[PDB]
């Protein structure tokens, strides 16, 4: 049996995650493909150069969870779409986590989050597909344990990629 | 004849103008096409309810100028290109000005700006032209005077429109 601790897709894009640095980086995007809107966190500073944009979740209560499973749903553009095949653009993003006994609120510090894994896409969406209203939606799941404190955080680091985070699900099994 | 006081197109986005509110609204964009880099200030917060985004230039030394002339080139997207294009989207932006004897720096008070005129496009670009890289670039020109202080500021106000500012040229006659 699955017990969901956090599901960004579920809530109507109202979680208001923390974004560093303030102003640039990730952003809360919206789309009307059906009468019901779709929410996501998109970033695409490709030809700008090297980028260090972080997106941190809310304070997730561990509960009695021992090992949690993190389901990501995202899209990544092909770097060959933009001027200059690479160096400018990247096709991956990093996943981070940080346990804490209490809510740090907006208190963010890069040095506190531990890198889980580089999130590579099974499919990148090409221009011809993207110029049409069809996108290749990737799915990647990671697990992490054992958790020890009352709660934890999740972070998403951008490194000059074109990524749209449609859905995250962190949960544990019974 | 024409002595230019400020030409945005000249500086390759080197200008870094003031944006308000801090972190949203007008943003400095880049368009590399056929290896010919083009820069612009653009905002397209069309469906995000009511907007009030401001773009102020740097302090321009008046000099012997008395009656200056302002030339703007821009692209405004047809509101019908967005679902929920009623009320939410606009097809114009505003041009303000302000006199000053000294560089106010970042001190931006929008209550100190007088309106010059509403800037409307002769040609709005529709999705078919936009997707085919055939955007239609409008050219509008206004004049303001007499200026009596050491310098002045030019301001651009978005109120819910999808505008791209590709060029400003301010000069006077001799």
């Amino acid at each position: 049996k699955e017990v969901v601790l956090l599901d960004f897709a579920a809530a109507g894009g109202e979680l208001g995650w923390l974004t560093h640095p303030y102003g640039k980086g990730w952003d809360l995007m919206q789309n009307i493909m059906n009468d019901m809107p779709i929410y996501m966190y998109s970033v695409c500073n490709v030809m700008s150069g090297d980028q260090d944009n972080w997106l941190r979740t809310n304070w997730v209560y561990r509960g009695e969870a021992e090992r949690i499973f993190i389901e990501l749903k995202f899209t990544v553009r092909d770097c060959n779409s933009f001027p200059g095949g690479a160096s400018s653009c990247k096709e991956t993003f990093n996943l981070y986590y940080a346990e804490s006994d209490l809510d740090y609120g907006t208190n963010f510090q890069k040095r506190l989050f531990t890198k889980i894994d580089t999130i590579a896409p099974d499919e990148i969406t090409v221009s011809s597909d993207f110029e049409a209203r069809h996108v290749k939606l990737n799915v990647e799941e990671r697990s992490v344990g054992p958790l020890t404190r009352k709660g934890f955080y999740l972070a998403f680091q951008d490194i000059g990629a074109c990524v749209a985070l449609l859905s995250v699900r962190v949960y544990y099994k019974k | 004849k024409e002595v230019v006081l400020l030409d945005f197109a000249a500086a390759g986005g080197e200008l870094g103008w003031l944006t308000h509110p801090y972190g949203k609204g007008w943003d400095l964009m880049q368009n590399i096409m056929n290896d010919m880099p083009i820069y612009m200030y653009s905002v397209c917060n069309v469906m995000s309810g009511d907007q009030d985004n401001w773009l102020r230039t740097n302090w321009v030394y008046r000099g012997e100028a008395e009656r200056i002339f302002i030339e703007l080139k821009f692209t405004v997207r047809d509101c019908n290109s967005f679902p929920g294009g009623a009320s939410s989207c606009k097809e114009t932006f505003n041009l303000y000005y302000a006199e000053s004897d000294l560089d106010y720096g970042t001190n931006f008070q929008k209550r100190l700006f007088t309106k010059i005129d509403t800037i409307a496009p002769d040609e709005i670009t529709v999705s078919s032209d936009f997707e085919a890289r055939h955007v239609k670039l409008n050219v509008e020109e206004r004049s303001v005077g007499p200026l009596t202080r050491k310098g002045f500021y030019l301001a651009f106000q978005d109120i819910g429109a999808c505008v791209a500012l590709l060029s400003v040229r301010v000069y006077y006659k001799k």
Partner: peptide, 10 residues
């Protein structure tokens, strides 16, 4: 865009 027809959301 990193997703077609995406507007900034409040």
């Amino acid at each position: 865009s990193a997703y077609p027809d995406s507007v900034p959301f409040r």
